[PDB]
Design a protein around this ligand. Structure first.
Ligand code: HEM
Ligand SMILES: Clc1[nH]c2ccccc2c1-c1nn(-c2ccccc2)cc1Cn1ccnc1
Length: 394
């Protein structure tokens, strides 16, 4: 006898397990066990993944309900699960979304300058270089300090919360509350700080004193800062790190993009499609009995939407493991989700990766791994897949 299939399958972010394709073919919705011991339905085809994400009766908010089957323990207060809904109810969605586009004057130049400085320091120090800890993550951190309007020198401390805050744990995590409460106090201070006049926190600080927002809570204003910094930094740093691996493993593509950088946006869209940065399926709780494929999902059950299930589905993306810059459906992947909860940072995440890759290919056209790929150490029980270090030479 064997136990019920456990998720996640593998923390490795450099290859998809052969098993995903066999599951998609045989049982594109099927029962699994999460690290908490809960049962869940794992959805792994493009068609069924999009069905679940576009039907709000598969609820994000309700995943936080006491007593629900859980993917993992919350590392945030349960109200944060409904963060975007709370932002919309407060009348803040348009302003928040406008502040996190990559369009502010100077933003892209700042990204380019920062990437080039980071790369020059690595070149000066000499190979090998760690492209996660000394390039992708500092680039993400610097970007989000700029986007939020907060001092660059405050970035590293906020960043160091994230190796715990985005854990995927069976049990509550005492350090997550300590860091959460500290980071909330920081953002509350930022809202009171008269020098903070630009970016997301500068805008929230003005709206906070506007009569139309006088009953929006100071807790929610601070929560927006903490959550958008953390989600954006972990998501862009992790995605860029594992996209760099996929690029380095493809010398012909690396060379093509170095030679024709106008193709980098199309290359980044494929790197998004094939990205394994999300370590777990996206969780939703059924609020009704709903037919998904051959399974009648019952009210109260947990559903997990496997992004790489959709994004490597050959029925939607032929030759799914190959990076093709001429696909007819290039942005139709699920790397940013789909539906009500589609990532509000998508444009920023694209631009962070495009500029980081453009800068890397110009400065380090010969970039290559400095260790055999199997020597990368994949972080476990985390909400992202990332190598602890990414050692390269050039
Ligand atoms: C390449 C980078 C990124 C990737 C791959 C990514 C991916 C995703 C995905 C898949 C979702 C959907 C979650 C769900 O439906 O359960 C999402 C939601 C979200 N992302 Fe991103 N993200 C990235 C960058 C960012 C950035 C830069 C920010 C902010 C600065 C951000 C903020 C958020 C927020 C606040 C949500 C929640 C939306 C909601 O619950 O409605 N993300 N992201
Ligand atoms: Cl949840 C959720 N929903 C969101 C919607 C919009 C932005 C963020 C979130 C989060 C979230 N924030 N966060 C966090 C923790 C500390 C600092 C900054 C962020 C970790 C998670 C994810 N997590 C937690 C428990 N299980 C999953």
């Amino acid at each position: 006898a064997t136990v019920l299939l456990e998720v996640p399958f593998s923390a490795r972010g450099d290859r998809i397990p052969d098993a995903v394709a066999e599951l998609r073919t045989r049982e594109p919705i099927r029962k699994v066990r999460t690290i908490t011991g809960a049962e869940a339905w794992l959805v792994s085809s493009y068609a069924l993944c999009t069905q679940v994400l576009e039907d709000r009766r598969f609820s994000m908010k309700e995943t936080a309900a006491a007593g629900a089957p859980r993917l993992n323990a919350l590392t945030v207060p349960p109200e944060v699960v409904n963060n975007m809904g709370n932002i919309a109810d407060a009348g803040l969605r348009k302003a928040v979304m406008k502040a996190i586009t990559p369009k502010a004057p100077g933003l892209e130049q700042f990204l380019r300058d920062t990437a080039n400085s980071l790369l020059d320091n690595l070149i000066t120090e000499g190979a090998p270089a760690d492209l996660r800890n000394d390039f992708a993550d500092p680039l993400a951190t610097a970007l989000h300090c700029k986007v939020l309007g907060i001092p660059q020198e405050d970035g590293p401390k906020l960043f160091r919360s994230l190796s715990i805050a985005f854990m995927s744990s069976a049990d509550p995590i005492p350090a997550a509350k300590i860091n959460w409460d500290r980071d909330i106090e920081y953002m509350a201070g930022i809202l009171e700080n008269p020098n903070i006049t630009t970016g997301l926190m500068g805008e929230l600080s003005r709206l906070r004193k506007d009569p139309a927002y006088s009953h929006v809570s100071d807790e929610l204003f601070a929560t927006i800062g903490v959550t958008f910094f953390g989600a954006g930094v972990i998501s862009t740093g992790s995605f860029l790190t594992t996209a760099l691996i996929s690029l380095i493993q493809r010398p012909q593509l690396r060379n093509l993009l170095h030679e024709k950088p106008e193709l980098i946006p199309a290359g980044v869209e494929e790197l998004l499609r094939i990205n394994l940065s999300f370590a777990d399926g996206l969780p939703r709780l059924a609020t009704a009995d709903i037919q998904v494929g051959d399974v009648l999902v019952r009210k109260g059950e947990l559903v997990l939407v496997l992004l790489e299930g959709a994004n490597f589905d050959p029925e939607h993306f032929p030759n799914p493991g190959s990076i093709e810059l001429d696909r007819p459906n290039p942005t139709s992947h699920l790397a940013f989700g789909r539906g009500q909860h589609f990532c509000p940072g998508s444009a920023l995440g694209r631009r962070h990766a495009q500029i980081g890759i453009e800068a890397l290919l110009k400065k380090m056209p010969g970039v290559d791994l400095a260790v055999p790929i199997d020597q990368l150490v994949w972080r476990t029980r985390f909400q992202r897949r990332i190598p602890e270090r990414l050692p390269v030479l050039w």
